[PDB]
Amino acid sequence: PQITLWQRPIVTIKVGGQLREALIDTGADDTIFEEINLPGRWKPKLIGGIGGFMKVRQYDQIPIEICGHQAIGTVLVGPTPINVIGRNMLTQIGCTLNF
Amino acid sequence: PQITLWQRPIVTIKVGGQLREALIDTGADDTIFEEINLPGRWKPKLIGGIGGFMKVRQYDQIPIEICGHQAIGTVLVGPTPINVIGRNMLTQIGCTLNF
Numbered sequence: 406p407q408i409t410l411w412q413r414p415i416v417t418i419k420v421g422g423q424l425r426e427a428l429i430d431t432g433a434d435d436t437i438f439e440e441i442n443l444p445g446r447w448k449p450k451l452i453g454g455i456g457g458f459m460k461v462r463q464y465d466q467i468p469i470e471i472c473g474h475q476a477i478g479t480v481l482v483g484p485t486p487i488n489v490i491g492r493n494m495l496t497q498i499g500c501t502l503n504f
Numbered sequence: 505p506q507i508t509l510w511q512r513p514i515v516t517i518k519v520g521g522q523l524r525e526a527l528i529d530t531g532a533d534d535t536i537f538e539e540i541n542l543p544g545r546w547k548p549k550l551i552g553g554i555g556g557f558m559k560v561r562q563y564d565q566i567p568i569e570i571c572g573h574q575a576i577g578t579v580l581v582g583p584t585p586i587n588v589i590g591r592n593m594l595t596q597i598g599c600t601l602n603f
């Protein structure tokens with residue numbers, strides 16, 4: 406779809422068999438979820454944002470459905486205040502900015 | 505223009521008579537710059553992101569030019585690792601997401 410920005414651009418996700426909502430976030434390189442339970446191996450990773458850094462688990466090659474569109478990629482798990490879909494996934498679903 | 509997301513969506517800004525680059529950030533409610541010098545009164549404000557919170561100065565009714573488009577609104581000043589154009593300004597320039 407087209408999404409305007411009068412409200413936070415939140416969409417419905419399916420990831421690791423679980424349903425979540427997440428913010429379409431063009432300012433995020435990476436995709437990060439709080440409180441999902443993903444299978445298999447992971448590596449610790451530190452991420453930097455406003456306010457400092459955060460420790461996350463990095464999972465690779467994770468399938469995700471983003472507003473009905475399929476992608477696969479890295480998903481970070483850690484204490485984000487809101488789940489975010491970043492550019493690593495947005496490029497796969499053909500998401501663009503327009504003005 | 506249309507901007508794809510294979511690279512960070514960075515654009516050229518003019519704000520407070522100064523030139524900067526900033527990230528088009530749909531995941532930011534607010535617009536925040538590091539190291540600009542804005543005129544007049546301001547209020548302290550705390551902002552939350554990944555990694556915790558940040559103290560900023562809030563300036564109201566600040567003109568900005570974003571990739572050649574005019575807007576006016578709140579601009580936060582504080583130690584962000586990258587300057588960000590948030591939804592408060594993006595709505596004024598007619599920015600949308602599309603996929």
Ligand SMILES: CC(C)CN(C[C@@H](O)[C@H](Cc1ccccc1)NC(=O)O[C@H]1CO[C@H]2OCC[C@H]21)S(=O)(=O)c1ccc(N)cc1
Pocket residue numbers: 428430431432433434435436437452453454455487489491529530531532533534535536551552553554584585586588590
């Ligand atoms: C829902 C939040 C994440 C909103 N953030 C905007 C977000 O786009 C920024 C944009 C941004 C970019 C770099 C540094 C700080 C913030 N942050 C971000 O943390 O991305 C992180 C996830 O992937 C990595 O790639 C970029 C940093 C990592 S925020 O910077 O904390 C923020 C929150 C409120 C306002 N008004 C302005 C900015």
